[PDB]
Write an enzyme that holds these catalytic residues in place. Structure first.
Site, mmCIF file in Angstrom:
data_model
loop_
_atom_site.group_PDB
_atom_site.id
_atom_site.type_symbol
_atom_site.label_atom_id
_atom_site.label_comp_id
_atom_site.label_asym_id
_atom_site.label_seq_id
_atom_site.Cartn_x
_atom_site.Cartn_y
_atom_site.Cartn_z
ATOM 1 N N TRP A 1 -70.945 8.626 -57.599
ATOM 2 C CA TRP A 1 -71.595 8.512 -58.905
ATOM 3 C C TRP A 1 -70.782 8.972 -60.117
ATOM 4 C CZ3 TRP A 1 -76.577 6.550 -59.804
ATOM 5 C CH2 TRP A 1 -77.324 6.252 -58.648
ATOM 6 N N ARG A 28 -81.685 -5.747 -54.552
ATOM 7 C CA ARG A 28 -81.669 -6.757 -55.610
ATOM 8 C C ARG A 28 -80.263 -7.258 -55.930
ATOM 9 N NH1 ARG A 28 -79.632 -5.077 -60.161
ATOM 10 N NH2 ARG A 28 -79.389 -2.833 -60.549
#
Ligand SMILES: NC(=O)C1=CN([C@@H]2O[C@H](COP(=O)(O)OP(=O)(O)OC[C@H]3O[C@@H](n4cnc5c(N)ncnc54)[C@H](OP(=O)(O)O)[C@@H]3O)[C@@H](O)[C@H]2O)C=CC1
Ligand SMILES: O=c1ccn([C@H]2C[C@H](O)[C@@H](COP(=O)(O)O)O2)c(=O)[nH]1
Ligand SMILES: N=C(N)NC(=N)Nc1cc(C(F)(F)F)ccc1Cl
Lengths: 325, 219
Positions: free
Chosen positions: A121, A227
């Site tokens: 991250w 997604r």
């Protein structure tokens, strides 16, 4: 053999192999095409890469790199038979496990991962990144109401990464573990990270929208909807990540892991990853390794890095999906 | 063209290899390749103990026959040798291999058993088996028998010699994905003489993952 001809007729509308899109060269996948039977589970992954290169749509994207894409794929992995860590290239799991434990604790502090030398991250928590997301009042590395926060505190108002959100928001994780334990036939055992209200407050929206569980005959199965899927870099880790997650949930609920099902929405291949994938698609898979979890861990929150062990990982050599030199 | 013996007589090989204990190449930065799986036996027996699934596979392959395909095979072998119940396959093994099999399984069921040996002759065996002291004899025997396919279930020494002479049409190779102590190994398959054409599903049996791959003799 009379059926033989009817088959041919029924294909009267499949036109020429020129309008097959993206000028692909066979020779780049000889080894891959030579194979008669490709039943090793890793081929579920590879076959999609192939389909996307051969039939993918040329699109641009949020990054500009340009990608080939298709919509809607599904992969199924039998965790009672093996741990699906890709073998056509080298992978490490320490990072994704620390990330997973990080999610389970409801953390949103990137510093925690960076202090364990896990940079997954890091790029999403810089001043620049945060500012381009309009999070001008967000401290560097305060990722916002992402996965962790949603798993333990969905609904609660996000303040900052140091706040104490105890008994605030809906603790989904806690909830699903109870449903599998006490109401195994429930068709409402879902974990959702896509909190529509907090999307813009997150460093970026989650790619793993939801998980749904299924329990039968003392065996737990999991379906995860993604997604956006980066076949080249992301997916390999996503597969591993949730397979491990299914094992953990399965254990703390006194069940045996079964199927991990991966549903891919927007499945794409970054143009700058194509050469590396070509190379990869011509490597033959090795048998998958296995995953071992400390059995004494009975609570989903009591897991630690040392409780996870991957054994007999036989894999081809490391590959940078973005080769230069 | 000059038909190959292994083709006329459908002679295949089938084995199961585990990973060898190469002390200390063992931790990371270790390189892997098809030769990573080469451990065949240890102390006149199998390295790993027994693998149920691997066995189910072994019996399934070596006993399966297709009657509707014989006539075609008969014609082939006959034309080759200049000629004109219950079909069975043939299994050929080294003497050491034959002895390492529990008596309850000898001779392998529903299979024409052929043992290779120089120290033993038919008078030394009580079972219904064929004994031969030369590889050339197997060929003569095959020319005289009615059977579907011939499988070299080996012995490392046997596998080795049948590969050099090019008597293998395909190799049904089982990759046991775990490590055990070994003293005999399968030969290093030459990426140029043989090439993998099929890889099966992956499974777990007796606490280890494993799969099955089929090598095929290149043209
Ligand atoms: N993992 C697997 O799939 C398998 C493993 N194994 C293991 O392999 C080991 C046995 O292999 P290995 O020691 O190589 O022995 P083999 O089974 O290859 O037996 C070798 C012996 O067979 C005979 N032989 C071989 N070639 C000929 C020939 N051309 N003419 C006459 N006789 C011949 C000889 O018998 P003699 O001494 O009488 O002259 C010879 O010394 C065991 O540990 C067994 O458990 C065995 C099969 C399969
Ligand atoms: O776990 C993850 C996280 C991200 N991505 C990829 C998908 C996209 O390529 C990019 C995110 O872009 P957007 O969908 O947010 O536009 O990161 C994955 O494949 N797996
Ligand atoms: N297991 C394999 N796929 N290979 C093999 N050749 N094994 C094998 C196994 C057996 C036994 F299990 F019946 F004893 C006997 C002889 C051989 Cl050669």
């Amino acid at each position: 053999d009379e059926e033989e001809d009817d088959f041919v007729y029924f294909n009267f509308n499949k036109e020429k192999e020129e309008k097959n899109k993206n000028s692909i060269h066979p020779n780049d996948f000889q080894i891959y095409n030579s194979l008669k039977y490709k039943y090793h589970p890793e081929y579920q992954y590879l076959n999609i890469i192939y389909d996307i290169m051969m039939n993918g749509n040329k699109q641009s994207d949020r990054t500009g790199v340009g990608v080939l894409s298709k919509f809607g794929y599904i992969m199924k992995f039998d965790l009672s038979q093996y741990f699906p860590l890709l073998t056509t290239k080298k992978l490490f799991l320490r990072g994704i496990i620390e990330e997973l434990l990080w999610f389970i604790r409801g953390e949103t502090n990137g510093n925690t991962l960076l202090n364990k030398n896990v940079r997954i991250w890091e790029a999403n928590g810089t001043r620049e990144f945060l500012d381009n997301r309009k999070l001008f009042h967000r401290e560097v590395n305060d990722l916002g109401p992402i996965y962790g926060f949603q798993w333990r505190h969905f609904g609660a108002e996000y303040t900052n990464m140091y706040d104490n959100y105890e008994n605030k928001g809906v603790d989904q994780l806690k909830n699903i573990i109870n449903l599998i334990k006490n109401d195994p036939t429930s068709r409402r055992i879902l974990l959702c990270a896509w909190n529509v209200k907090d999307l813009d407050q997150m460093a970026l929206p989650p790619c793993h929208i939801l998980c749904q569980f299924y329990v039968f005959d003392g065996k737990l199965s999991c379906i995860m909807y993604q997604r956006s899927c980066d076949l080249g870099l992301g997916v390999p880790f996503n597969i591993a990540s949730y397979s491990i997650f299914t094992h953990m949930i399965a254990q703390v609920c006194n069940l045996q892991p079964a199927q991990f099902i991966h549903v891919l929405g927007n499945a794409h291949v970054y143009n700058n990853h194509i050469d590396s994938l070509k190379i990869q698609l011509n490597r033959i898979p090795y048998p998958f390794p296995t995953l071992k979890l400390n059995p004494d861990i009975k609570n989903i929150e009591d897991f630690t890095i040392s409780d996870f062990t991957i054994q007999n990982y036989v894999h081809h050599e490391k590959i940078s999906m973005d080769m230069a030199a | 063209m000059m038909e190959q013996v292994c083709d006329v007589f459908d002679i295949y090989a089938i084995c199961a290899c585990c990973k060898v204990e190469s002390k200390n190449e063992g931790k990371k930065n270790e390189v892997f390749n098809n030769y990573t799986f080469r451990g065949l036996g240890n102390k006149g027996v199998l390295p790993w103990k027994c693998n149920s699934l691997d066995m189910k596979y072994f019996c399934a392959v070596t006993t399966y026959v297709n009657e509707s395909k014989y006539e075609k095979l008969k014609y082939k072998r006959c034309k080759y040798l200049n000629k004109e119940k219950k079909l069975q396959n043939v299994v050929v093994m080294g003497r050491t291999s034959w002895e390492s099999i529990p008596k309850k399984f000898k001779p392998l069921s529903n299979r024409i058993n052929v043992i290779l040996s120089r120290t033993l002759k038919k008078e030394d065996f009580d079972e219904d088996v064929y004994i031969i002291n030369k590889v050339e004899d197997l060929i003569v025997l095959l020319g005289k028998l009615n059977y579907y396919k011939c499988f070299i279930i080996g012995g490392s020494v046997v596998y080795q010699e049948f590969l050099e002479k090019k008597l293998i049409k395909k190799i049904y190779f089982t990759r046991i994905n775990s490590t055990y102590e070994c003293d005999v190994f399968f030969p290093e398959i030459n990426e140029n003489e043989y090439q993998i054409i099929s890889v099966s599903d992956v499974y777990t049996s007796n606490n280890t993952t494993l799969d099955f791959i089929i090598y095929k003799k290149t043209n």
